[PDB]
Paper text:
The dipeptidyl peptidases (DPP) 8 and 9 are serine proteases of the dipeptidyl peptidase 4 activity/structure homologues (DASH) subfamily which cleave post-proline bonds two residues from the N-terminus of a substrate. While [name] and FAP are extracellular or secreted proteases, [name] and [name] are located intracellularly to the cytoplasm and nucleus. There, they play important roles in diverse biological processes such as pyroptosis or ubiquitin-mediated proteolysis, turning them into promising targets for chemical probe and anti-inflammatory or anticancer drug discovery. Here, we show the exploration of the natural product Sulphostin, a [name] inhibitor, as a starting point for [name]/9 inhibitor development.
We therefore also determined an X-ray structure of [name] after incubation with Sulphostin, which confirmed the observations made with [name]. Again, covalent modification of [name]’s active site serine S630 with a phosphosulfamate group, the product of a nucleophilic attack of the active site serine coupled to a Walden inversion, was exclusively observed, thereby indicating a general covalent reaction mechanism of Sulphostin with DPPs. In agreement with the previous IC50 measurements, these assays confirmed with a kapp of 36,963 M−1 s−1 the preferential binding of Sulphostin to [name], followed by [name] with a kapp of 317 M−1 s−1 and finally [name] with a kapp of 11 M−1 s−1.
Numbering used by the authors:
A (entry chain B): 38 to 766
B (entry chain A): 39 to 766
The structure:
Amino acid sequence: FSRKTYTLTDYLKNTYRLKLYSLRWISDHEYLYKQENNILVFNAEYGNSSVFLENSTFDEFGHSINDYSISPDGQFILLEYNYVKQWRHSYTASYDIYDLNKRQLITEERIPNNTQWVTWSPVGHKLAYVWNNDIYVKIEPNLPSYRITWTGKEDIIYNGITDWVYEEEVFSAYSALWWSPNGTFLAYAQFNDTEVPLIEYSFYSDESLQYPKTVRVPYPKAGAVNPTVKFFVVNTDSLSSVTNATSIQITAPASMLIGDHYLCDVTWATQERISLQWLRRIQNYSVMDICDYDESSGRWNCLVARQHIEMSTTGWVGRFRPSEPHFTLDGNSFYKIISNEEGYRHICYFQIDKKDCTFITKGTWEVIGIEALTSDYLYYISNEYKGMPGGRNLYKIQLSDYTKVTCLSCELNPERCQYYSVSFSKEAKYYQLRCSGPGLPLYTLHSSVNDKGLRVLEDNSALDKMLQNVQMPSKKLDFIILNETKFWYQMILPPHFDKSKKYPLLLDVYAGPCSQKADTVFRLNWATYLASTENIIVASFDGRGSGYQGDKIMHAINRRLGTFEVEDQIEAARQFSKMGFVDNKRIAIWGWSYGGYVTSMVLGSGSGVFKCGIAVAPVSRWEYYDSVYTERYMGLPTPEDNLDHYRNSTVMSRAENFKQVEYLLIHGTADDNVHFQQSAQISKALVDVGVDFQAMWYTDEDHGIASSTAHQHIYTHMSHFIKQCFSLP
Amino acid sequence: SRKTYTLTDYLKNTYRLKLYSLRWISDHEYLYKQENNILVFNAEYGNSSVFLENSTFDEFGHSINDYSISPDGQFILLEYNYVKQWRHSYTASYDIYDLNKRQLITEERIPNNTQWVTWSPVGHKLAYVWNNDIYVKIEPNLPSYRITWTGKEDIIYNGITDWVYEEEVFSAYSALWWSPNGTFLAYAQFNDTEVPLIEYSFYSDESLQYPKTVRVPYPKAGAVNPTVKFFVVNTDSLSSVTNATSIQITAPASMLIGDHYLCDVTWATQERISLQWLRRIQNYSVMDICDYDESSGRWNCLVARQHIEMSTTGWVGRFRPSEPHFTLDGNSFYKIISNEEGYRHICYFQIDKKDCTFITKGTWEVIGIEALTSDYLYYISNEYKGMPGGRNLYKIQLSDYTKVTCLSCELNPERCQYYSVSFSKEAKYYQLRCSGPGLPLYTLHSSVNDKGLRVLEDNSALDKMLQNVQMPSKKLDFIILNETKFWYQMILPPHFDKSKKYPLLLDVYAGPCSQKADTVFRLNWATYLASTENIIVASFDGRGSGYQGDKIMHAINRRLGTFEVEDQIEAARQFSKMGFVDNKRIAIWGWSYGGYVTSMVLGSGSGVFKCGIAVAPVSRWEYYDSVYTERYMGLPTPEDNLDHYRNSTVMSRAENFKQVEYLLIHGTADDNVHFQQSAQISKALVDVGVDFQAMWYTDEDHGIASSTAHQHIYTHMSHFIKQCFSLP
Ligand SMILES: *[C@@H]1O[C@H](CO)[C@@H](O[C@@H]2O[C@H](CO)[C@@H](O[C@@H]3O[C@H](CO[C@H]4O[C@H](CO)[C@@H](O)[C@H](O)[C@@H]4O)[C@@H](O)[C@H](O[C@H]4O[C@H](CO)[C@@H](O)[C@H](O)[C@@H]4O[C@H]4O[C@H](CO)[C@@H](O)[C@H](O)[C@@H]4O)[C@@H]3O)[C@H](O)[C@H]2NC(C)=O)[C@H](O)[C@H]1NC(C)=O
Ligand SMILES: *[C@@H]1O[C@H](CO)[C@@H](O[C@@H]2O[C@H](CO)[C@@H](O[C@@H]3O[C@H](CO)[C@@H](O)[C@H](O)[C@@H]3O)[C@H](O)[C@H]2NC(C)=O)[C@H](O)[C@H]1NC(C)=O
Ligand SMILES: *[C@@H]1O[C@H](CO)[C@@H](O)[C@H](O)[C@H]1NC(C)=O
Ligand SMILES: *[C@@H]1O[C@H](CO)[C@@H](O)[C@H](O)[C@H]1NC(C)=O
Ligand SMILES: *[C@@H]1O[C@H](CO)[C@@H](O)[C@H](O)[C@H]1NC(C)=O
Ligand SMILES: *[C@@H]1O[C@H](CO)[C@@H](O)[C@H](O)[C@H]1NC(C)=O
Ligand SMILES: *[C@@H]1O[C@H](CO)[C@@H](O)[C@H](O)[C@H]1NC(C)=O
Ligand SMILES: *[C@@H]1O[C@H](CO)[C@@H](O)[C@H](O)[C@H]1NC(C)=O
Ligand SMILES: *[C@@H]1O[C@H](CO)[C@@H](O)[C@H](O)[C@H]1NC(C)=O
Ligand SMILES: *[C@@H]1O[C@H](CO)[C@@H](O)[C@H](O)[C@H]1NC(C)=O
Ligand SMILES: *[C@@H]1O[C@H](CO)[C@@H](O)[C@H](O)[C@H]1NC(C)=O
Ligand SMILES: *[C@@H]1O[C@H](CO)[C@@H](O)[C@H](O)[C@H]1NC(C)=O
Ligand SMILES: *[C@@H]1O[C@H](CO)[C@@H](O)[C@H](O)[C@H]1NC(C)=O
C-alpha cells in the first residue's frame, strides 16, 4: 500500500509497452521479422537468422517509408510512402519497386501516385494495382502495365476495390481483387453506387481553410438503395499490348437475381475452381456457387446442382456473414463452420457433388475459426476448454478418426495462457501460438510433426519486471444465473481489493450482436487506470445477443435491438449492486458505438440503478445506420416488415427519463460510420424535453477519435466526468 | 423575506413589459392592434373606432401571422404560412380582403412562397417578389405585370437582398422603393454568381434519414463579393401586351473603378432619387442625386451634384453612411456627419452648393434625425447631463440654430433618461417611448406647443407585481483610464452592502460602436443572477464603443481584438480594487463579438478571470463576412492587414486557457457566425491539451431563440456560473 499506481498519463503516453512478435511467413520453413527497421529472415526449424534487408539501404531515398511488401519469390520489394488514410481499411499511397538482385529502384513504368490498392500474385512477382477505380496488371515490375477495366469513376463505379459499406460490413477490407493460387487468373468484384444516396457532413480542416469542405460519401442507410455487384475473372497469361484484356463475368445464381443480394465471400479452391458465396438483402438465405474453368471454351460454369444453400429460421446466416470455406488441396471437398441442430457452431465436412455435410465437431461450445488444413489434420480454435466461452485454445482433429481430438495450447501454461490465436507456415509445417491473457502475452513457435515446443519468440519479461513495481488491478472472470442460464461477466478489481469495503462500479458496455466483453485477455487500457489509481470496479457483462455461446443466446435479439441486451445490462448491474463490495449510490455506465446506444437506452430506462454515464459516438436510431449491418438484425424499416420496432427502439423517445441521470454525450464531426447526425438528434430530443447534460464534439475526428491529441483529450474529459460523478479527489 | 426574480421567471416570462406599437396612417390618426382588433385612434381627442373586428377572420382556415392595410384603407394583406429564412428574410402566402365589398379577393391571388410584398405609399398598388422576380398589381383583383425575368435562386436577386446585403447593409430583405406617389418603383439587382457558398448540415426532424446540406452565397473576408445594379420602372405606363422598360441608374465613376456597395436609397421628391454608394474599402462614400427627364424618360445624375463623405481616422458612418432627410422641395437635406473634433452632428446640405453647414456642435453625438418641418428639425442625442448612455428628443429652430429645446428631458427625469420617438406623417403629433431607468412609459404629444396630451401605457400592472419581488438596482457611473471617462453599469443585488464582498460576472459585447452601459430597464438573465444568486453583473464601454466621438470609436481601426480586449481586463481589474467585489470570483461572458472578446480575455493570461462563457463566438476574422469585417480590418492580404488578421485569432491563444474554466456554446445551423468558428477554437484547445466544457445546439441559428433551446442554454450557463462561484 502507498506505492506507484497505473496513472492516466501511463495509459496516454504509453509508459508500459506490450512487445509483439509480428512475423510474415514467406515459405513452409522461413518467416520475415522487422527489428529496429532491419528486416531479418528466420529459419523455423533451427532458429538461425540473417539480415534480409539492411535499415541503411533506404537512407538517401527522399521519402518516409510507411510499409514494405516483398514479392513471394524474394526478387522485389514494394516501398509504400505518402500514406493518406480514408476509412477503416481504405487509403491512398505512392509506390516504388526495388530490385533486390540488381540492388536498384525501378525508375521506368512506375506505379502511379494516389494508388488505391497494390498486391503481388501469391507466387512469382506479378502486380495488380487499382488507380482511379480501374484495375491494372504488371507481368514484370520494369515493363508497362495492362489496363483491365475502363468503367471506373470516383464515387460511382469501383473496379477491384470496395465501396464504403462493402469495406466496413462485408469484406472488412478495401481490396476486391483475388489472384488464383499459381497467379494465372485475377478475379475481381465491380460495385455500382449510381443510385446509392450520399451522407454529407462538414470537414473544417486547418485554420487556413476559409470555407469548410463538404465530404460526400455513397452510404446506404437502413432501407435505402444498396450498391449492385458484378463478378469478373481475367487470364493474366494472355495479355497483349495490341488488344484489350477480355474479362469473363460470373453471373450470381437465379435465386439471388430475383431481388437485392450481396457478394459476401470469394475463395479459390484450385487453379480452375472458384467458390463464390452470395447473400440475399434479407440475410437468412445464402448460396455458395462452385465455378469451374472450361479449358476449351474459356468460360466459367457454375452448375446449379453443385450449389450449397445455408439458411436460418431463428435469425441471420453466420456470426456477421456466411463463414469462410477451407478446401482440401484437390478442391473436391471443404470444411465450413455451420450452426448445428442444437444451435452451436461446429465444423461441417462438405463433398462437392454430394448432398448435406457431416459434422466432425459437436458439444455445448463453439469453433471460433478453422486455422489450417493438412492431409492428416484440420487445425481449429474453440472455447471448449473448462466450458469458458471467453477462452480460446488451438485444437487438432485427425481426419481418419474424428474422435481423436488433441488440444495443442490448453496445457502449455494453464495459469498464464487461456486465450490463443495462431499463424501457420505456408503448408502448416510450423505454427506461431500467440497468448494474449490472462497473464502477459507470450509468443512461441512449434513444429506440426510432433507438436514440439521449439522456441520462445517474446515472453514480455521487460514489462513483467516493470509491473511488479506498480499497484496493478486483478481481473475476475465468472458468471451469474438469469432464468437458469449462465451469463459471463468480468470485473477489473482495484489493487488490494477488499470484500468488506464498498467500491463505485463503472459498467463498460458494447453488447452488440455476437459481441464478447467478458474474456481472459490482458489489456493495459482506461479501465486499468480507473481500478489502479481511482479504485473503481470496471465491470463488463455478456447478456442476450452476445456471441460464442450458441444461437439460443445470440439470436434472442433478432428483429429486436435495444431490448434484451439493454434489460440484461441493467439486471447485471442490479445483481452486482446486491453483492456486498459495490456502492449502489455510485454505479456508472459507458460505451462506444453500439456501446453508446446501449449506454443511452439504459440511462433512458428509468431503472434507478445508474447515477451517470458516457455515450461516445452512439447509434441513436437504426434508420441512420448502414443497410448491411442494421438489416442483418432488424430487417427493413417498412410497415410490412419491422418499422414498428425501428421506431420503438430510439434513444430520442426516452428523453424524459434522462432527468434522473447525469449524461455526457461525445461524437466526432467527421464520423463517416456512426454519423454525427445520431448524437445531433439525441441532443435535440434532450433540449426539446428540457433535460440538462454535458456534451463534447471533436472537430474532424472519425469513429476512432484516434488522433494523438483527441485520444488524450476525450479520456481526460471522461476521467473528470467519472471522478466528479463518484466524488473522488 | 419576499420572493426573488428566479431563472423560471426570466424563461417562462412571468413579468411582462407591456408595449404600445402604433403605425401612423395620416398626420392625425394612428392604427393600434388590441385583442386581435385593429383600432384607428384620433391623436388630438383620443377617441377610436374598430377598423377590423377580431371575429371577421374566424372561418379563414389559416393562422394569420401579420396584417398590412393599404394607405387608402380600401384593402388589407393577410400574411399566413410564415416560414422564416434569415434575420429579416422569410417566405409566406398572401390573401387580400376588400373592406368595401367585405370579401376575400378570390381571383389573380398573390402566389404561395412570395418573398416580399409592399403597398405603394399612397393608394392600393402592390409590388411583390416571387422566384427572385418583381411583379406589380395596380388593382388587387386584376392580374399582375412581370417586371424582371432574370431572377434565379441563389444567383440573381431582383427586388430582394442576398445574405450579406440583408444582414450588414440594408438590415432588411426588401430591395424595393416606391416613389412618394405610386408612379415609380425603384429596385436593386444583386448578382451572387461568383460568390462562394457556406455549406453546413441541417438534421431536421427525427424522421429525416439523410441530413440536408444548406448552401448559402456568403462572401467571407477578402472573398468575391456580390455585384449590384439599380433600376427604376414607371408603373403608370404598364401595358398588358408589351414588357415593362427598366431604366438603369449607373453608379458614379469613382465607384466603378473597383468593388463597391449600394448602401442607401432615399426618394427626395416625385421626380428625384438620392443613391449613396460605398467603396469595398469603406473610407470613401458618394451620394448621387438623380432627376427624371420627362421628355427622354431617362434618369440623369449630374456629376456636380455629387456629395463625397470620407474618413481618415477609420470608416464612413457608425455602420454605414447615414440616411439623408430632404426638405419638402428636395433642393436641400440634413445628414448626421462626423465634425472636425470627431463628434457626430447634423449638417445642412443645399443640392447645387459644395460642402454643408453644421447645425449642432459639442462633446456629445446626435443619434438620429427623427422629423423635419419648415420651422423645426426633431433629433435624438445624448447631450443631457453629459451621459452617452442617455437618449432625449430635442428640437432645433431652423431660423436660429442657437434656439435648442429638449422635449423629453424634464417629463419625468428620475424614471425616464432613454427616449425613442415616432412622429405623425407631417410631424403634428409624436409618441415618446421611455425605456428606463424606470418601467417603460408611452406618452402622446402635440408638436404645436409640445403639450403632453395623454398616457398610452405606463406599466402600472407590472409595477404592482414587482413590489412583491426582491428586485436588483442598477448603478450607471464611469472610471478614469489614461485621463479619459469610460462608462460602466452594474446590476447590483437587492439589499446591496458595500461592506460585504460579491462575485462579479462581466457581461461583454464591446464590438465597434457598441454601448452596454446605458439607462435602459431590462428583465433579462442578469436580473436573475443579481436577484436570486447575489451576483454583480457589470458591463463596460471601452475603446471602440460608440456615441462618444471617433477618438474612442476609431481607436480599434484595423486592430480588432486589441484595445477593446485590454480595456475589459482593466475595467474588471479596477472593479476588483473596489471593496465590495471578490477578486477570486470574477467571470466574463458574451455572444458573437462578445464571444470573441470573452475568448480573447480568457486567452490573455491576465489572471483576473477564473471562468467564462463564449456563445456563438467569432474565432478568426477571415471566417466572418466581407462587409462587416473589412469595414474595421481592411482586406486579408499581405499588401493590406493580413498580419493583424492572423495575429487576432482565439486559436493562437489556446495555451493560456489552461489557467481558466471555459464553456464554448454554438448552434450548428448558425448562418451568421458559422459553427466552423467554434469548431476551430475546440480543435486548437484539444491540439494543446486544454480541458473545457462545450455544448452544440442542433439546427439552432445565431439567436438560439427556439422556446426549448433558449430555456436549455440559460439553464446550462446558470449551472456553469453557479459551480464556478461555489453557490448553493
Ligand atoms: C451502374 O448502374 C446504373 C443503374 O443503376 C447504370 O446506368 C443505367 O444504365 C441503363 C442502361 O444503359 C440506363 O437505361 C437506358 O437509358 C437509355 C436512355 O438514356 C437516357 O435516359 C435515361 C432515363 O430514361 C437516363 O437515365 C440516362 O442518363 C440518359 O439520359 C435508354 O435508351 C435505354 O433503353 C435501351 O434498352 C432497352 C432494354 O434493353 C431497350 O428496349 C431500348 O430499346 C434501348 O435499346 C438500346 O440498348 C439496347 C441494349 O441491348 C440495344 O439493343 C438497342 O439497339 C439500343 O441501343 C436504357 O433504358 C439507365 O437509365 C441508367 N440509369 C442511371 C440512373 O444512370 C450504369 O450503366 C451502371 N454502370 C455499369 C458500368 O455497370
Ligand atoms: C451575373 O454576373 C456574371 C459574372 O459574375 C455574369 O456572367 C458573365 O457574363 C459575361 C457577359 O459579358 C460573360 O462574358 C462574355 O462571355 C462570352 C463567352 O461566354 C464571350 O464571348 C463574351 O465576349 C463575354 O466575354 C461572362 O463569361 C460571364 N461569366 C460567368 C462566370 O458566367 C452574368 O451575366 C450576370 N448576370 C446578370 C443577369 O447580370
Ligand atoms: C540500424 O541497424 C544497426 C545494426 O543492426 C543498429 O545499430 C541501428 O540501431 C539501426 N538503426 C536505427 C534503429 O535507426
Ligand atoms: C541457417 O543456417 C544454414 C546453415 O548454415 C544456412 O544455410 C541458412 O542460410 C541459415 N538461414 C538463415 C535464415 O540465415
Ligand atoms: C508523384 O509526385 C511527385 C511530385 O509531383 C513526382 O515527382 C512523381 O513523378 C510522381 N510519381 C509518378 C509515378 O509519376
Ligand atoms: C479498349 O476499350 C476502350 C473502351 O472502353 C477504348 O478506349 C480502347 O480504344 C480499347 N483499346 C484498344 C486497343 O482497342
Ligand atoms: C415497444 O416498447 C415498449 C417500451 O419498452 C414496450 O412496452 C413494447 O412491448 C414494445 N413493443 C412494441 C411492439 O411496440
Ligand atoms: C375580440 O374583441 C373584444 C373587444 O371588442 C374582446 O373583449 C374579445 O376578448 C376579443 N376576442 C378575441 C378572440 O380576440
Ligand atoms: C373621433 O370623433 C369624431 C367626432 O365624432 C369623428 O368624426 C371621428 O371619426 C372619430 N375618430 C375615430 C378614429 O373614431
Ligand atoms: C397555395 O396553396 C394552397 C394549398 O396549400 C392552395 O389551395 C392555393 O391555391 C395556393 N395559392 C395560390 C395563390 O396558388
Ligand atoms: C418579355 O421578355 C421575355 C424574355 O425576357 C419574353 O419571354 C417575352 O416574350 C417578352 N415579351 C415581349 C412582348 O417582348
Ligand atoms: C405622380 O408624380 C409623377 C412625376 O413624374 C407624375 O408623372 C404623375 O402624374 C403623378 N401622379 C399623380 C396621381 O399626381
Ligand atoms: C501580435 O499580438 C501580440 C499579442 O500579445 C502583441 O504582443 C504583438 O505586438 C502583436 N503584433 C503582431 C504583428 O501581431
